[PDB]
Amino acid sequence: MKIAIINMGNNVINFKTVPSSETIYLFKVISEMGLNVDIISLKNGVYTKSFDEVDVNDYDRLIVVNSSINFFGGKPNLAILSAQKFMAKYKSKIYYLFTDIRLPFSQSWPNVKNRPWAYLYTEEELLIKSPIKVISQGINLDIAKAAHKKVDNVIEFEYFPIEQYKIHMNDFQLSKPTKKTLDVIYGGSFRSGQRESKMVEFLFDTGLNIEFFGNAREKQFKNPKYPWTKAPVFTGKIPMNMVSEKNSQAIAALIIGDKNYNDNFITLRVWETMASDAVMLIDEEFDTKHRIINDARFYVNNRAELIDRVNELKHSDVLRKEMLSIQHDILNKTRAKKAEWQDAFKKAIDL
Ligand SMILES: O=c1ccn([C@@H]2O[C@H](COP(=O)(O)OP(=O)(O)O)[C@@H](O)[C@H]2O)c(=O)[nH]1
């Protein structure tokens, strides 16, 4: 049993980029599961083999991490093109890891064919005809199915909390008490504006010392529907393996998501935040049934409630420590089900 895992549109090398990091982490957690897996990318490296040095059909299972297939500047993107050529040659079922609602499986050929450089490729080369099974991080498969409505070869859907790899990794550990320099923190990208209203609501004009780290930039928030005066402080992006340490500099860390994530997707930040030294504060709409932690003190409905909660946390060190103790225990509750999680993944990829 040999498994191949690839990222459909991003080069994989190290932990300097998020897509590369997620791919390596998945490779690691699958390996720690007792499975023989290889990461196939553009070049041979510390964690990878190149597309050229291997035969896709030498593998028994092909796993693909979701990604956009958009061509920046309209120019060829070898990460995208090489990955799909690899996939198109595979003669068995493909397992697509759907971790981001905006990145459902999509065919590059329909786009490439109209490009002025189309002559460089053919339909037979890029068109992926193998049947595809979507492994949805979201529990709502109707939403997963609707997202893949344009690709008829995606004929199977199954829910699996992919993002838990963060807590099941053999090297995982909870963050230690950290000196506080911030009131609230949130790390992420602008996600093409899909979450602008929520970002402005909880991170702007709060009167608190808030930091927004990651790819996002202040100038991207210009939608007239979500105006603001005082923005949080934007700092550069950091490696994925340094995220919890970063969250730990703040008294609290925000949990928000895209509209389609509400009561559907549990995201990486949920675990990265819960494991940190920052109290997890969740937007009520993101988890209305409080399935993350059955304690209302971890939830906020709007900007005003977030500010009030942070003031309480700043006022009572006892409250802050209690809540940290609670979220750490709750996280460990899920870690205790590692064996089941591992078995569910194997079942997901027909093992
Ligand atoms: O500087 C940064 C900011 C974010 N992240 C990662 O990016 C994720 C957030 O991704 P996204 O912005 O798409 O938001 P989500 O939809 O995951 O909430 C975080 O959980 C981290 O794992 C990172 O590695 N470095």
Tab-separated table of C-alpha atoms and ligand atoms in Angstrom:
chain	number	residue	atom	x	y	z
A	1	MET	CA	0.000	0.000	0.000
A	2	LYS	CA	1.708	3.136	-1.297
A	3	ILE	CA	0.013	6.532	-1.068
A	4	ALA	CA	0.718	9.709	-3.017
A	5	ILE	CA	-0.361	13.129	-1.772
A	6	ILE	CA	-0.031	16.335	-3.758
A	7	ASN	CA	-1.199	19.929	-3.588
A	8	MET	CA	-3.202	20.728	-6.722
A	9	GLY	CA	-1.955	24.279	-7.169
A	10	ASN	CA	0.953	25.162	-4.888
A	11	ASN	CA	4.601	24.184	-4.805
A	12	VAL	CA	5.537	22.187	-1.701
A	13	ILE	CA	8.917	22.747	-0.046
A	14	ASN	CA	8.867	23.847	3.591
A	15	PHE	CA	6.845	25.688	6.218
A	16	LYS	CA	7.331	29.179	4.743
A	17	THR	CA	3.945	29.014	2.997
A	18	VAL	CA	0.583	27.831	4.312
A	19	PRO	CA	-0.357	25.570	1.387
A	20	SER	CA	3.075	23.925	1.569
A	21	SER	CA	2.772	23.584	5.360
A	22	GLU	CA	-0.679	21.961	5.263
A	23	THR	CA	0.551	19.459	2.673
A	24	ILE	CA	3.604	18.476	4.730
A	25	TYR	CA	1.558	18.263	7.948
A	26	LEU	CA	-0.896	15.934	6.211
A	27	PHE	CA	2.026	13.882	4.917
A	28	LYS	CA	3.341	13.668	8.491
A	29	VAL	CA	0.072	12.715	10.197
A	30	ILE	CA	-0.616	10.088	7.520
A	31	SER	CA	2.894	8.693	8.019
A	32	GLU	CA	2.401	8.673	11.805
A	33	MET	CA	-0.730	6.648	11.115
A	34	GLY	CA	1.495	3.789	9.967
A	35	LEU	CA	0.867	4.429	6.262
A	36	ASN	CA	3.508	4.619	3.524
A	37	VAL	CA	3.084	8.022	1.878
A	38	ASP	CA	5.069	10.245	-0.501
A	39	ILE	CA	4.515	13.913	-1.279
A	40	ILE	CA	4.830	14.547	-5.022
A	41	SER	CA	5.650	18.117	-6.069
A	42	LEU	CA	7.645	20.089	-8.656
A	43	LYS	CA	11.071	19.086	-7.347
A	44	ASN	CA	12.688	16.479	-5.136
A	45	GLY	CA	13.356	17.878	-1.673
A	46	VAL	CA	13.453	17.321	2.070
A	47	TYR	CA	9.807	16.201	2.112
A	48	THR	CA	9.087	15.585	-1.571
A	49	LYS	CA	9.698	13.684	-4.785
A	50	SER	CA	9.260	15.335	-8.187
A	51	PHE	CA	6.400	14.592	-10.577
A	52	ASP	CA	9.036	13.502	-13.126
A	53	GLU	CA	10.792	10.859	-11.023
A	54	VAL	CA	7.639	8.881	-10.266
A	55	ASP	CA	4.856	6.992	-12.024
A	56	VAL	CA	1.479	8.074	-10.619
A	57	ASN	CA	0.033	4.624	-11.230
A	58	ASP	CA	2.696	3.090	-8.985
A	59	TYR	CA	0.581	4.383	-6.094
A	60	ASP	CA	-2.535	2.668	-4.732
A	61	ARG	CA	-4.196	5.872	-3.531
A	62	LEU	CA	-3.900	9.440	-4.819
A	63	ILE	CA	-4.755	12.201	-2.344
A	64	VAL	CA	-5.045	15.819	-3.491
A	65	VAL	CA	-5.061	18.913	-1.261
A	66	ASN	CA	-7.508	21.500	-2.592
A	67	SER	CA	-6.330	24.708	-4.237
A	68	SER	CA	-7.405	27.383	-6.682
A	69	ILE	CA	-6.503	26.769	-10.324
A	70	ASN	CA	-6.613	30.436	-11.296
A	71	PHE	CA	-3.664	31.585	-13.394
A	72	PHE	CA	-2.148	34.749	-11.963
A	73	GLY	CA	-1.655	37.343	-14.673
A	74	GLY	CA	-3.097	34.823	-17.111
A	75	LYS	CA	0.314	33.156	-17.316
A	76	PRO	CA	1.054	29.420	-16.964
A	77	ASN	CA	1.371	28.117	-13.395
A	78	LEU	CA	3.399	24.907	-13.394
A	79	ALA	CA	2.248	23.939	-9.901
A	80	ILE	CA	-1.335	23.839	-11.190
A	81	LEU	CA	-0.563	22.455	-14.649
A	82	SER	CA	1.888	19.786	-13.452
A	83	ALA	CA	-0.440	18.614	-10.682
A	84	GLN	CA	-3.403	18.196	-13.016
A	85	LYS	CA	-1.325	16.396	-15.666
A	86	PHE	CA	-0.314	14.021	-12.864
A	87	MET	CA	-3.939	13.559	-11.806
A	88	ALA	CA	-5.178	13.076	-15.380
A	89	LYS	CA	-2.816	10.128	-15.854
A	90	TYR	CA	-4.013	8.376	-12.683
A	91	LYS	CA	-6.373	5.518	-13.564
A	92	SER	CA	-8.002	4.999	-10.161
A	93	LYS	CA	-10.172	7.033	-7.783
A	94	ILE	CA	-8.861	10.373	-6.558
A	95	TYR	CA	-9.402	11.596	-3.001
A	96	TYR	CA	-9.838	15.367	-2.880
A	97	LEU	CA	-9.289	16.972	0.526
A	98	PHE	CA	-11.818	19.811	0.692
A	99	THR	CA	-10.558	22.001	3.554
A	100	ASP	CA	-11.497	25.400	2.101
A	101	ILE	CA	-15.011	26.201	0.841
A	102	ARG	CA	-13.621	28.492	-1.877
A	103	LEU	CA	-11.452	25.736	-3.396
A	104	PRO	CA	-13.685	22.948	-4.740
A	105	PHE	CA	-12.224	20.652	-7.387
A	106	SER	CA	-12.125	22.338	-10.792
A	107	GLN	CA	-10.773	21.425	-14.250
A	108	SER	CA	-7.959	23.599	-15.606
A	109	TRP	CA	-8.494	22.607	-19.248
A	110	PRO	CA	-11.675	24.676	-19.805
A	111	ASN	CA	-9.584	27.713	-18.886
A	112	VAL	CA	-6.279	26.730	-20.498
A	113	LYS	CA	-7.921	25.968	-23.860
A	114	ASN	CA	-8.813	29.634	-24.399
A	115	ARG	CA	-5.412	30.964	-23.303
A	116	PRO	CA	-3.028	32.173	-26.021
A	117	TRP	CA	-0.561	29.552	-24.765
A	118	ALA	CA	-3.122	26.747	-25.006
A	119	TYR	CA	-1.112	25.086	-27.785
A	120	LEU	CA	1.363	24.017	-25.082
A	121	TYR	CA	-1.186	21.565	-23.651
A	122	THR	CA	-3.936	19.210	-24.795
A	123	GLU	CA	-7.266	18.040	-23.413
A	124	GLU	CA	-6.044	14.460	-23.039
A	125	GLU	CA	-3.118	15.781	-21.020
A	126	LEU	CA	-5.016	18.012	-18.556
A	127	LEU	CA	-8.601	16.730	-18.423
A	128	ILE	CA	-9.035	14.614	-15.289
A	129	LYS	CA	-11.586	11.864	-15.970
A	130	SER	CA	-11.029	9.567	-12.984
A	131	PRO	CA	-13.860	9.387	-10.456
A	132	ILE	CA	-13.332	11.711	-7.490
A	133	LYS	CA	-14.302	11.385	-3.855
A	134	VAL	CA	-14.486	14.626	-1.908
A	135	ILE	CA	-13.410	14.379	1.721
A	136	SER	CA	-15.269	17.344	3.196
A	137	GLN	CA	-13.932	19.071	6.305
A	138	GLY	CA	-17.461	20.409	6.659
A	139	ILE	CA	-20.151	18.115	8.047
A	140	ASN	CA	-22.791	19.514	5.682
A	141	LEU	CA	-22.395	17.395	2.552
A	142	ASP	CA	-25.183	19.254	0.734
A	143	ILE	CA	-22.949	22.312	0.835
A	144	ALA	CA	-19.989	20.231	-0.334
A	145	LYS	CA	-22.057	18.791	-3.196
A	146	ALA	CA	-23.313	22.210	-4.319
A	147	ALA	CA	-19.725	23.493	-4.406
A	148	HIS	CA	-18.789	20.654	-6.779
A	149	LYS	CA	-21.892	20.937	-8.958
A	150	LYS	CA	-19.835	21.897	-12.035
A	151	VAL	CA	-17.697	18.723	-12.029
A	152	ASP	CA	-19.691	15.559	-12.766
A	153	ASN	CA	-16.823	13.150	-12.045
A	154	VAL	CA	-16.989	14.028	-8.338
A	155	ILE	CA	-19.386	11.244	-7.393
A	156	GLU	CA	-18.676	10.583	-3.711
A	157	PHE	CA	-18.730	12.732	-0.574
A	158	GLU	CA	-17.730	11.983	3.007
A	159	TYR	CA	-17.241	14.167	6.059
A	160	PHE	CA	-13.973	13.955	7.996
A	161	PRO	CA	-12.460	16.550	10.370
A	162	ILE	CA	-9.236	16.901	8.389
A	163	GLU	CA	-8.078	19.956	10.346
A	164	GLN	CA	-7.592	17.921	13.536
A	165	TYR	CA	-4.175	16.850	12.244
A	166	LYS	CA	-2.922	19.847	14.207
A	167	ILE	CA	-3.759	18.201	17.542
A	168	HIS	CA	-3.052	14.560	16.631
A	169	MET	CA	0.541	15.170	15.507
A	170	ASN	CA	3.081	13.306	17.677
A	171	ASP	CA	4.949	16.558	18.393
A	172	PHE	CA	1.891	18.507	19.562
A	173	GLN	CA	1.828	20.368	22.857
A	174	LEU	CA	-0.232	23.084	24.544
A	175	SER	CA	1.212	26.608	24.682
A	176	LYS	CA	2.703	27.723	28.005
A	177	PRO	CA	1.810	30.872	29.986
A	178	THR	CA	3.045	33.773	27.861
A	179	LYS	CA	3.722	37.428	28.637
A	180	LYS	CA	0.817	39.396	27.179
A	181	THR	CA	1.404	42.266	24.746
A	182	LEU	CA	-2.007	42.294	23.037
A	183	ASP	CA	-5.680	42.213	23.958
A	184	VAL	CA	-6.945	40.369	20.880
A	185	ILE	CA	-5.273	38.697	17.923
A	186	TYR	CA	-6.311	37.058	14.653
A	187	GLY	CA	-4.102	35.516	11.994
A	188	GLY	CA	-5.181	34.868	8.427
A	189	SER	CA	-5.534	36.103	4.855
A	190	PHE	CA	-8.128	38.469	3.389
A	191	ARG	CA	-9.795	35.395	1.854
A	192	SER	CA	-10.839	37.532	-1.128
A	193	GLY	CA	-13.302	39.504	0.988
A	194	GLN	CA	-15.459	36.495	1.851
A	195	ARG	CA	-15.247	37.424	5.537
A	196	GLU	CA	-14.907	41.207	5.482
A	197	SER	CA	-18.052	41.970	7.473
A	198	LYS	CA	-17.027	39.661	10.319
A	199	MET	CA	-13.428	40.916	10.321
A	200	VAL	CA	-14.547	44.548	10.542
A	201	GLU	CA	-17.160	43.717	13.199
A	202	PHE	CA	-14.802	42.019	15.660
A	203	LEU	CA	-11.365	43.476	14.862
A	204	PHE	CA	-11.934	47.138	13.907
A	205	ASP	CA	-12.974	50.130	16.047
A	206	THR	CA	-12.874	48.114	19.270
A	207	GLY	CA	-10.767	50.493	21.335
A	208	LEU	CA	-8.608	47.466	22.180
A	209	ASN	CA	-4.991	46.633	21.276
A	210	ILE	CA	-5.670	44.230	18.415
A	211	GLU	CA	-3.256	42.627	15.958
A	212	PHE	CA	-4.154	41.050	12.610
A	213	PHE	CA	-1.220	38.953	11.403
A	214	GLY	CA	-0.899	37.109	8.121
A	215	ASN	CA	-1.418	37.959	4.456
A	216	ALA	CA	-4.237	40.481	4.959
A	217	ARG	CA	-3.498	44.201	4.586
A	218	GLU	CA	-5.406	47.274	5.771
A	219	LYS	CA	-5.902	48.642	2.253
A	220	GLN	CA	-7.919	45.554	1.276
A	221	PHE	CA	-10.760	46.541	3.618
A	222	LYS	CA	-12.591	49.093	1.486
A	223	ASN	CA	-16.096	47.687	1.004
A	224	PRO	CA	-18.402	50.696	1.624
A	225	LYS	CA	-20.923	48.337	3.249
A	226	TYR	CA	-18.506	47.640	6.112
A	227	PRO	CA	-16.969	51.048	6.966
A	228	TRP	CA	-14.491	51.668	9.770
A	229	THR	CA	-12.280	54.350	11.295
A	230	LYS	CA	-9.659	52.617	13.463
A	231	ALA	CA	-8.067	49.461	12.079
A	232	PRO	CA	-6.187	46.801	14.041
A	233	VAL	CA	-2.410	46.602	13.600
A	234	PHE	CA	-1.406	44.494	10.586
A	235	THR	CA	1.835	42.538	10.861
A	236	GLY	CA	3.457	40.233	8.318
A	237	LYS	CA	2.723	36.550	7.831
A	238	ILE	CA	4.492	33.903	9.905
A	239	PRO	CA	5.189	30.196	9.346
A	240	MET	CA	2.265	27.911	10.148
A	241	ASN	CA	4.393	26.130	12.765
A	242	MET	CA	4.774	29.404	14.722
A	243	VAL	CA	1.058	30.271	14.865
A	244	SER	CA	0.103	29.099	18.351
A	245	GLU	CA	3.124	30.881	19.809
A	246	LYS	CA	1.865	34.015	18.061
A	247	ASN	CA	-1.726	33.664	19.308
A	248	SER	CA	-0.258	33.288	22.815
A	249	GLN	CA	0.917	36.906	22.925
A	250	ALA	CA	-2.721	37.985	23.280
A	251	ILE	CA	-5.252	37.770	26.096
A	252	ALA	CA	-7.764	36.404	23.582
A	253	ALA	CA	-7.873	35.118	19.998
A	254	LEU	CA	-10.863	35.430	17.644
A	255	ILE	CA	-12.710	32.587	15.919
A	256	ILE	CA	-14.815	33.597	12.899
A	257	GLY	CA	-15.443	31.977	9.536
A	258	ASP	CA	-17.068	32.245	6.119
A	259	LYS	CA	-20.865	32.137	5.950
A	260	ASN	CA	-20.785	28.510	4.755
A	261	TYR	CA	-18.513	27.505	7.644
A	262	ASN	CA	-21.143	28.331	10.266
A	263	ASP	CA	-22.199	25.182	12.148
A	264	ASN	CA	-20.418	23.264	9.401
A	265	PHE	CA	-16.622	23.573	9.343
A	266	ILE	CA	-14.314	23.416	12.349
A	267	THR	CA	-11.165	25.188	11.161
A	268	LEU	CA	-7.460	24.920	11.962
A	269	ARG	CA	-7.546	28.176	13.930
A	270	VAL	CA	-10.019	26.564	16.340
A	271	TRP	CA	-7.297	24.115	17.366
A	272	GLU	CA	-4.394	26.578	17.037
A	273	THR	CA	-6.303	28.969	19.299
A	274	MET	CA	-7.598	26.417	21.796
A	275	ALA	CA	-4.062	25.056	22.221
A	276	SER	CA	-2.605	28.536	22.742
A	277	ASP	CA	-2.243	30.714	25.828
A	278	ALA	CA	-4.974	33.003	24.481
A	279	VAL	CA	-8.599	32.535	25.501
A	280	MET	CA	-10.699	31.406	22.550
A	281	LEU	CA	-13.581	33.783	21.788
A	282	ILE	CA	-16.002	32.477	19.188
A	283	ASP	CA	-18.529	34.349	17.061
A	284	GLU	CA	-21.919	32.954	18.133
A	285	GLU	CA	-23.009	32.548	14.506
A	286	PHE	CA	-19.998	30.309	13.753
A	287	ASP	CA	-21.117	27.665	16.275
A	288	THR	CA	-24.678	28.385	17.463
A	289	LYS	CA	-25.041	25.066	19.280
A	290	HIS	CA	-21.759	25.638	21.129
A	291	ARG	CA	-20.372	22.304	19.951
A	292	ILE	CA	-16.786	23.546	20.348
A	293	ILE	CA	-17.088	24.223	24.099
A	294	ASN	CA	-20.325	23.978	26.072
A	295	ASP	CA	-19.713	27.209	28.010
A	296	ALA	CA	-21.286	30.502	26.852
A	297	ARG	CA	-18.364	32.577	28.154
A	298	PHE	CA	-16.342	31.552	25.080
A	299	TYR	CA	-18.927	33.054	22.730
A	300	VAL	CA	-19.612	36.599	21.531
A	301	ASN	CA	-22.475	37.902	19.391
A	302	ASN	CA	-21.070	41.239	18.251
A	303	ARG	CA	-18.379	43.888	18.651
A	304	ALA	CA	-19.815	45.211	21.925
A	305	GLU	CA	-19.920	41.760	23.546
A	306	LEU	CA	-16.358	41.009	22.407
A	307	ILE	CA	-15.109	44.229	24.008
A	308	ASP	CA	-17.004	43.496	27.236
A	309	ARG	CA	-15.653	39.933	27.371
A	310	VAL	CA	-12.078	41.151	26.852
A	311	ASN	CA	-12.494	43.694	29.650
A	312	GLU	CA	-13.689	40.933	31.986
A	313	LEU	CA	-10.664	38.836	31.004
A	314	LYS	CA	-8.337	41.781	31.619
A	315	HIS	CA	-10.039	42.441	34.944
A	316	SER	CA	-9.951	38.886	36.300
A	317	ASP	CA	-6.758	36.870	35.881
A	318	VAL	CA	-8.652	34.115	37.698
A	319	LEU	CA	-11.345	34.048	35.008
A	320	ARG	CA	-8.759	34.089	32.221
A	321	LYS	CA	-6.822	31.175	33.708
A	322	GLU	CA	-10.005	29.199	34.352
A	323	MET	CA	-11.109	29.561	30.743
A	324	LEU	CA	-7.644	28.590	29.504
A	325	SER	CA	-7.801	25.498	31.700
A	326	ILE	CA	-11.227	24.638	30.293
A	327	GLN	CA	-10.299	24.970	26.616
A	328	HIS	CA	-7.052	23.026	27.117
A	329	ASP	CA	-8.969	20.135	28.706
A	330	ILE	CA	-11.627	20.206	25.991
A	331	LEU	CA	-8.902	20.061	23.357
A	332	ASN	CA	-7.338	17.049	25.072
A	333	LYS	CA	-10.766	15.399	25.061
A	334	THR	CA	-10.609	15.249	21.264
A	335	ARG	CA	-6.943	14.224	21.314
A	336	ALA	CA	-8.009	11.233	23.412
A	337	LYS	CA	-9.952	10.015	20.359
A	338	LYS	CA	-6.854	9.907	18.151
A	339	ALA	CA	-7.208	6.196	17.353
A	340	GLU	CA	-10.787	6.650	16.154
A	341	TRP	CA	-9.793	9.688	14.074
A	342	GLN	CA	-6.987	7.719	12.412
A	343	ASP	CA	-9.351	4.837	11.649
A	344	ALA	CA	-11.941	7.222	10.208
A	345	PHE	CA	-9.331	8.699	7.863
A	346	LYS	CA	-8.244	5.278	6.611
A	347	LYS	CA	-11.899	4.409	6.047
A	348	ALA	CA	-12.309	7.711	4.186
A	349	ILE	CA	-9.611	6.759	1.674
A	350	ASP	CA	-10.990	3.227	1.335
A	351	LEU	CA	-8.407	1.486	3.530
B	1	LIG	O1	0.680	34.449	9.272
B	1	LIG	C1	-0.090	33.488	9.220
B	1	LIG	C2	-1.522	33.553	9.217
B	1	LIG	C3	-2.237	32.425	9.097
B	1	LIG	N1	-1.652	31.184	8.974
B	1	LIG	C4	-2.462	29.965	8.818
B	1	LIG	O2	-3.601	30.278	8.035
B	1	LIG	C5	-4.799	29.829	8.721
B	1	LIG	C6	-5.942	30.749	8.389
B	1	LIG	O3	-6.386	30.528	7.057
B	1	LIG	P1	-7.480	31.482	6.404
B	1	LIG	O4	-6.950	32.872	6.434
B	1	LIG	O5	-7.918	30.891	5.111
B	1	LIG	O6	-8.684	31.436	7.451
B	1	LIG	P2	-9.637	30.229	7.893
B	1	LIG	O7	-10.596	30.182	6.760
B	1	LIG	O8	-8.687	29.090	8.005
B	1	LIG	O9	-10.164	30.774	9.173
B	1	LIG	C7	-4.400	29.831	10.186
B	1	LIG	O10	-5.250	28.969	10.937
B	1	LIG	C8	-2.951	29.349	10.133
B	1	LIG	O11	-2.824	27.942	10.081
B	1	LIG	C9	-0.275	31.043	8.984
B	1	LIG	O12	0.282	29.964	8.890
B	1	LIG	N2	0.427	32.213	9.107
